[PDB]
Write a protein that binds this ligand. Structure first.
Ligand SMILES: Nc1ncnc2c1ncn2[C@@H]1O[C@H](COP(=O)(O)OP(=O)(O)OP(=O)(O)O)[C@@H](O)[C@H]1O
Ligand SMILES: Nc1ncnc2c1ncn2[C@@H]1O[C@H](COP(=O)(O)OP(=O)(O)O)[C@@H](O)[C@H]1O
Ligand SMILES: [Mg+2]
Ligand SMILES: [Mg+2]
Lengths: 173, 460, 51, 505, 86, 49, 115, 171, 85
């Protein structure tokens, strides 16, 4: 695991994407590079002791659908230091950075039954007012909740499931 | 089905990668086919995404990266009960005596918590032993811990064999012997001795020897404690003999660095105190039953300053300190009467007479040690006549501490002696009061009661 | 002696109280399973989403 | 019976949800857990683990939080959820827990019901300032003749009982606690790393030989996690600091501060912090220093402002008696030298005196008291000045004694009086001695009433003197115990008592 | 893994210009300052033993020529120095 | 006295098993704030004793 | 305006991150609003990337990982002159006595070259 | 079997371990030095006739195989406290100490009794040798104590004189 | 590099008596090739407790101090320790 390695390259990439008005393109290009990172035979090549420049060219060759500024240079700079496995991490970092700048929160909810649109709309507005962002709710129908809902906004969470209240009363007892 | 794969084999430490759901938890067991050999791994750390770092309970040779691993969802579990009596077992509770299956009714996990504070039971039921100096300087009670401290070759094993003979035979309850890091020859000799004496039917034996990889030497003590605690929970009084606590700590030290830990003061692991405490707080006498334990403690370089003996001093009721100085001088057992003590040596717990006798002996020998260098450089006749009287009585007393053992008969060519506590008190009281001032020094050397001293004096 | 007996009484009374508390809360869980429905779920949600 | 109680406890419940921060366990090892998330975590916070266990957020790294588990850690797992509470570590305080035995978190291990504390206090707190502290001129009587005569302790002082294994450190500490049965001084005993059965023995001794009602017992045995042992003395310090700032006096004992240092060493090394001289972290001095500088005597204005005017003129204090174990008597080791620099006066317990039977085995010349005679009561101060001189002369002259005769009679008497005053300063374990009893025994030594009785009977002589004085001259005992005063009439009355006793057995 | 003297704006200049020789080989920028030892980035024309001229009238002596950085020691008061000084 | 209070515990076990039914329904109704349906009570006996 | 963010807290050591133009000099002083109090940090090392490593001139408890840090351009400055006579002060030049404010005319930095 | 220098084996293993970047321990030796020497030395043994008969598939019957081992260790200025000698001393069934002082004094072989012991003891001797060696062992050890204790007493009790002269004879 | 799946084995037999050999089994005395009774593995495990037998037979060093005071038996492990030279 190399989150901290991904943060420098991810900051460089994101800071560059807003200088050239192509955040939406940069995100999918980073996804493209991550898919290259996932390949079995490419992974063996990455495990080899090739020199960084020739390894970077072997990597570039399978990713011709990349721009000069974005792909050919970031791949080679990462290859100089062997941090190509950080591409998967850079992608997630890049998404979070974007969500910060655009004042958005990917608030996640879980429910024992499907919510009506009015209920979901009230929850959306209520979290936009609890927070200071445009929320984007996504729901999952899990019977483990038994009833009530879960609301997660990253690290923060609000639990309204009856299972939580049941076991809370059990711990009060 | 198999669920994990090996990714690193560094020395005795193996890393296994699992799916990020249902990762094995700490102190679990895992299984892998090392060729035809079934090999058990014990999980020690949950680290990274889906990876656990483990220790092999067997030889790590023959392992390849990419081998499948099957995760058993329990810790290492061992047979417990009457079926373990009279059988030799390894760390995993597998028979190594070639008598067949154990035939157990119940199996218990070797990792378990210590008794709660309100479960503890107080006791002052003094045990009597045939050894003079131990009963005089450090008497101990049923349900307590005893530790025999000593350097290399000072008499730990001989004293423990003598104590087994003296205590266990009168004891009607079951006993457990945990051979932590023992020499193979001495384990075989112990097994055959018990088999000949017909006391093997009340002893359970767990042996993890010097040649085995570090994990076995690390966990064999816990196996022994598990068996002893089964007997304790049945309500019986148990005798637990542990051959070396030192090599439990040392088996920890060998693998500590490979687990990613930063080294401690003298190269030990950073977790020495906690690793000692978790093991040694389980060896207690609760209200349901009592465990009485005797432990042999190695002293590196014959220096009691080392962290291992230093920390294990703080865990024991009675501590018999053997010294290489007294062993080199030829006095056997090599107990240091100035250093050895017991917390049962109270005028309330023991006879008031007994307490005064012990205090006087210690005072006299302490006064001799300061005069040793004085006399050595300046000469015997520089002393006052009272000082010369004190010197005489000191040498006689320091002879009377010696004793022949039944199990130390092969080394010396003499019969073994057993002295009752009353006789020991009477003899030392007589010597200090001067009733035997006129006998020579060897009249007290290597004899039993003081009546035997006067008989040998007549022969002299 | 009387102090020890009183402490034992207190301890045992707490022990049995906790056992019966376990039983009661488990019964309550099964009752919830035997009684909850979508209308109750929406009632609970509307009491929750006010904050 | 059980309903109604359970009814009211059902009514004490909340149905609506609550907002909080949720972290995820990444790694578990050796009592330390690595937690991803909790961007709102803070230095020293409590993180709530599943199972009602708490962890302390020590390391705040850029991409992870390193927290130490306060409890059993063997079942925690990667991917588990943990909730952050916003609390720096709190523990209960009050008179309701006076007389009970608890753990570092304040939960009772007594087995005798829950607590009725009056409130909570933070484990970490800053010490009183320079202008808020008052000079120590009140006595703390330990009940041992040697310590109370030569090495006095004052209300607010920090004495150090330093010695080797099995020399009487625990005994001296618990006897001080026992001697505070009837003073207004509350007592606290902190058992760090002590084996459980020894703690049980000490507890039974405390209730047996006196009052455990006056003492809080903090217990952290060798089987509990390093964080709990590390923070046990600080929790005890919070409990004592309550009394300190309430206008009342207290006495706390830290058993084996060296083992607390060991626990801190383990915690620091598992968090990958850089090591120091004996592998200890760089701030071990800042561990014991900020632990001990909370023990002080406090002026009336501070305590009146703190108590908000509940009491107006009193001055509270918290006396401390930490314990240190040297190895083969090495005083230059890192932890002992740090503690010796931090404290003001040490009670040094030498081992070859203990083996010789001279118990308690305090050693003059090396053991001093930096607070001076301002901590002694007047009668103990007047009758103890010459004991120092007599022992000092004895030390050097006794070395000559062993091989000398036909000496100057002044030196002969100096030597022999030193030998018998050395004999006098020793006593049985669980027998504490009041100020009047110690006073008259020291008076017998100093005024020469032992000079013709310089033989082995001195112990029996002291016992007979105490029995006789109890038999017929009690009023002076009461007056001395109440006042501690000394003057010509008291001097003559003491002379009369000793003169009368010499007639008896 | 470690962050081996790689940071965002240097990376972004490499992103804009993959070959670094666009800047003169005679100059570089201070990247770290630690208790006297200084760490310059650039200076492709540097040899061990040189007298690297800092802003002001101060000198630093080149000691280590690494894969991507130059390590030097400051001769004088070093506390005035910051990142990015040419 | 210890035997005496052991018998006391037997009595209390039987007495409080009657209470656990009340407490179970009370908790269930409290946590959903609604009048619990008195139906399908076949399993109450195993929870009772 | 405060221009920095805390990125780590390990014991008494605090690492904070600034823009690459605003990186403090080696012995500069920084101030943080920890709880309600103000905490002074003295910079010790300039690591790469705008991070500087500092020692907290006070209690480190209660510090979060996102707090804003104000960058003072001078080192620790203390009152000097005749007004300091008869007063007790801490390291930062503030009264640990209770008599009141020190009426200084001049404040000097504690770091300077020898004569 | 003779292992002429176990310490040099330990040094070679240390070099291998450090070149492999394994974590170092006390005196830079890796922790498995004890494992090295232990798994080596415990291979020296005596095996019962059942083991021999099973191994040889029945060819050899009624015989016990045996291998005796004599490892050798170099001490630097007699520092027994060192890591490798401590481990090896802990493993073996006995010790034979050779000392520079005795060697220079002319006592060759430079064996020091009282610091050297054999745990097998009297069992590892012919009956005659057992009988006769029993006394020698105690005699020399207590001779050295008397020799130290009586350097300066010009006249002496002739019991101690007899033991002193007899110890000189045996030495 | 190919990976031959076999652990290190050494020549062994009665024909080695009188020969000077290196660690891998190659003679260095120059007196011709070996006459070995098959190969055997270098790294093996020791016999267990049940497979041992006690030591009761002597082996003579030929010296007086050793054979008298510190006897060696068949199956024993003796540490000869001292300074250089
Ligand atoms: N005045 C005394 N008279 C008799 N025995 C005493 C006296 N003082 C202490 N002892 C004895 O000394 C022994 C050790 O006492 P204590 O536990 O207080 O020592 P310590 O130095 O604190 O030991 P440790 O570090 O091992 O806990 C006990 O057996 C106790 O009975
Ligand atoms: N009581 C005794 N009588 C005779 N010889 C003894 C006695 N105690 C120890 N020895 C000798 O010292 C040797 C070393 O002690 P032993 O107990 O065997 O190993 P350790 O002391 O290392 O556990 C014994 O094998 C024996 O040779
Ligand atoms: Mg042994
Ligand atoms: Mg003690």
């Amino acid at each position: 695991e190399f989150i901290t390695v991904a943060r420098p390259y991810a900051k460089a990439a994101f800071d560059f994407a807003v200088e050239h008005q192509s955040v939406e393109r940069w995100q999918d290009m980073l996804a493209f590079a991550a898919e290259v990172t996932k390949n079995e035979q490419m992974a063996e090549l990455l495990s080899g002791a090739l020199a960084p420049e020739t390894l970077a060219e072997s990597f570039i060759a399978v990713a011709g659908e990349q721009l000069d500024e974005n792909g050919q240079n970031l791949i080679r700079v990462m290859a100089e230091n062997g941090r190509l496995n950080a591409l998967p991490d850079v992608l997630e970092q890049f998404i979070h950075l974007r969500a910060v700048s655009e004042a958005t929160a990917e608030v996640d909810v879980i429910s024992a039954a499907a919510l009506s649109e009015q209920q979901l709309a009230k929850i959306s507005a209520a979290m936009e007012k609890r927070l200071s962002r445009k929320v984007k709710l996504n729901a999952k129908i899990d019977k483990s909740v038994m009833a009530g809902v879960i609301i997660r906004a990253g690290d923060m969470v609000i639990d309204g499931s009856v299972r939580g209240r049941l076991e809370r009363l059990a711990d009060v007892l | 089905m198999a669920t994990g794969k090996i990714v690193q084999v560094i020395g005795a430490v193996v890393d296994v990668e699992f799916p990020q759901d249902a990762v094995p938890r700490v102190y679990d067991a895992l299984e892998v086919q090392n060729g035809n050999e079934r090999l058990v791994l014990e999980v020690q750390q949950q680290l990274g995404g889906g990876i656990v770092r483990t220790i092999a309970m067997g030889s790590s040779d023959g392992l390849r990266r990419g081998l499948d691993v099957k995760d058993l969802e329990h810790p290492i579990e061992v047979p417990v009960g009457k079926a373990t009596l009279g059988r030799i077992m390894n760390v995993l509770g597998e028979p190594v005596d070639m008598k067949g299956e154990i035939g157990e009714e119940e199996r218990w996990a070797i990792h378990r918590a210590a008794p709660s504070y309100e479960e503890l039971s107080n006791s002052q039921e003094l045990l009597e032993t045939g050894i003079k100096v131990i009963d005089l300087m450090a008497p101990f009670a049923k349900g307590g811990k005893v530790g025999l401290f000593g350097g290399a070759g000072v008499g730990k094993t001989v004293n423990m064999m003598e104590l087994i003979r003296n205590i266990a035979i009168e004891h009607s309850g079951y006993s457990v012997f945990a051979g932590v890091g023992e020499r193979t020859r001495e384990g075989n000799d112990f097994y055959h001795e018990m088999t000949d004496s017909n006391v093997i039917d009340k002893v359970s034996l767990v042996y993890g020897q010097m040649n085995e990889p570090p994990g076995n030497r690390l966990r064999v003590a816990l196996t022994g404690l598990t068996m002893a605690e089964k007997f304790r929970d049945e309500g019986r009084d148990v005798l637990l003999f542990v051959d070396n606590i030192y090599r439990y700590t040392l088996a920890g030290t060998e693998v500590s660095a490979l687990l990613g830990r930063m080294p401690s003061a003298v190269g030990y692991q950073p977790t020495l105190a906690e690793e000692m405490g978790v093991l040694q707080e389980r060896i207690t006498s609760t209200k349901t039953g009592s465990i009485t334990s005797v432990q042999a403690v190695y002293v590196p370089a014959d220096d009691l300053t080392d962290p291992s003996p230093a920390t294990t001093f703080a865990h024991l009721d009675a501590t018999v300190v053997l010294s290489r100085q007294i062993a080199s001088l030829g006095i056997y057992p090599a107990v240091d009467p100035l250093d050895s003590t017991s917390r049962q040596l109270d005028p309330l717990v023991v006879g008031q007479e007994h307490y005064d006798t012990a205090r006087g002996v210690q005072s006299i020998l302490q006064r001799y040690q300061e005069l040793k260098d004085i006399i050595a450089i300046l000469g015997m006749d520089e002393l006052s006549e009272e000082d010369k009287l004190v010197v005489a009585r000191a040498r006689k007393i320091q002879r009377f501490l010696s004793q022949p053992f039944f199990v130390a008969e092969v080394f010396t060519g003499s019969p073994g002696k057993y002295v009752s506590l009353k006789d020991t008190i009477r003899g030392f009281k007589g010597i200090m009061e001067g009733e035997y001032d006129h006998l020579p020094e060897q009249a007290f050397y290597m004899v039993g009661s003081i009546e035997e001293a006067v008989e040998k004096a007549k022969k002299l | 002696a009387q102090a020890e007996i009183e402490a034992e009484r207190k301890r045992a009374r707490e022990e049995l109280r906790k056992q019966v508390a376990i039983l009661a809360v488990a019964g309550a869980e099964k009752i919830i399973e035997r009684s909850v429905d979508e209308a109750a779920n929406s009632d609970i949600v509307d009491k929750l989403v006010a904050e | 019976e059980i309903s109604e109680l359970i009814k009211q406890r059902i009514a004490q419940f909340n149905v609506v949800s609550e907002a909080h921060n949720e972290g995820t366990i990444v790694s578990v090892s050796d009592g330390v857990i690595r937690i991803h998330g909790l961007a709102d975590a803070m230095q020293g916070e409590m993180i709530s683990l599943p199972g009602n266990r708490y962890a302390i957020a020590l390391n705040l790294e850029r991409d992870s939080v390193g927290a130490v588990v306060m409890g059993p850690y063997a079942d925690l797992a990667e991917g588990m959820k943990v909730k952050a509470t916003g609390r720096i570590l709190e523990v209960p305080v009050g008179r309701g827990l006076l007389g009970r035995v608890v753990n570092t978190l304040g939960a009772p291990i007594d087995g005798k019901g829950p607590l009725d504390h009056d409130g909570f206090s933070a484990v970490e707190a800053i010490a009183p300032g320079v202008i808020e502290r008052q000079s120590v001129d009140q006595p703390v009587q330990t009940g041992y003749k040697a310590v109370d005569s030569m090495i006095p302790i004052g209300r607010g002082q920090r004495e150090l009982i330093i010695g080797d294994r099995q020399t009487g450190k625990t005994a001296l500490a618990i006897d001080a606690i026992i001697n505070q049965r009837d003073s207004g001084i509350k007592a606290i005993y902190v058992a760090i790393g002590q084996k459980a059965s020894t703690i049980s023995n000490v507890v039974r001794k405390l209730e047996e030989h006196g009052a455990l009602a006056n003492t809080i017992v903090v217990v952290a045995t060798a089987s509990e996690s390093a964080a709990l042992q590390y923070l046990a003395p600080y929790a005890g310090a919070a409990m004592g600091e309550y009394f300190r700032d309430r206008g009342e006096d207290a006495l706390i004992i830290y058993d084996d501060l060296s083992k607390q240092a060991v626990a801190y060493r383990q915690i620091s090394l598992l968090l990958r912090r850089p090591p120091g001289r004996e592998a200890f972290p760089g701030d071990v001095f800042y561990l014991h220093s900020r632990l001990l500088e909370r023990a002080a005597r406090v002026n009336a204005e501070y305590v009146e402002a703190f108590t908000k005017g509940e009491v107006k003129g009193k001055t509270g204090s918290l006396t401390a008696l930490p314990i240190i174990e040297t190895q083969a008597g090495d005083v230059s080791a890192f932890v002992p030298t740090n503690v010796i620099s931090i404290t003001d006066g040490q009670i040094f317990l030498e081992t070859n005196l203990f083996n010789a039977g001279i118990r308690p085995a305090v050693n003059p010349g090396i053991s001093v008291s930096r607070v001076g005679g301002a901590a002694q009561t007047k009668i103990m101060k007047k009758l103890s000045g010459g004991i120092r001189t007599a022992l000092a002369q004895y030390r050097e002259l006794a070395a000559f004694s062993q091989f000398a005769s036909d000496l100057d009679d002044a030196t002969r008497n100096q030597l022999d009086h030193g030998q018998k005053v050395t004999e006098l300063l020793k006593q049985k374990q669980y027998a504490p001695m009041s100020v009047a009893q110690q006073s008259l025994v020291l008076f017998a030594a100093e005024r020469g009433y032992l000079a013709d009785v310089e033989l082995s009977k001195i112990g029996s002589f002291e016992a007979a003197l105490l029995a006789y004085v109890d038999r017929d001259h009690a009023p002076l005992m009461q007056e001395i115990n109440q006042t501690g005063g000394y003057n010509d009439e008291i001097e003559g009355k003491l002379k009369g008592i000793l003169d009368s006793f010499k007639a008896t057995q | 893994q470690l962050n081996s003297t790689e940071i965002s704006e240097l990376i972004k200049q490499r992103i804009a210009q993959f070959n670094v020789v666009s800047e003169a080989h005679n100059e570089g920028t201070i990247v770290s300052v630690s208790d006297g030892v200084i760490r310059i980035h650039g200076l492709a024309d540097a040899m061990q033993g040189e007298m690297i001229s800092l802003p002001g009238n101060r000198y630093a002596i080149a000691l280590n020529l690494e894969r991507d950085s130059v390590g030097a020691v400051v001769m004088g008061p070093y506390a005035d120095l910051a990142e990015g000084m040419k």
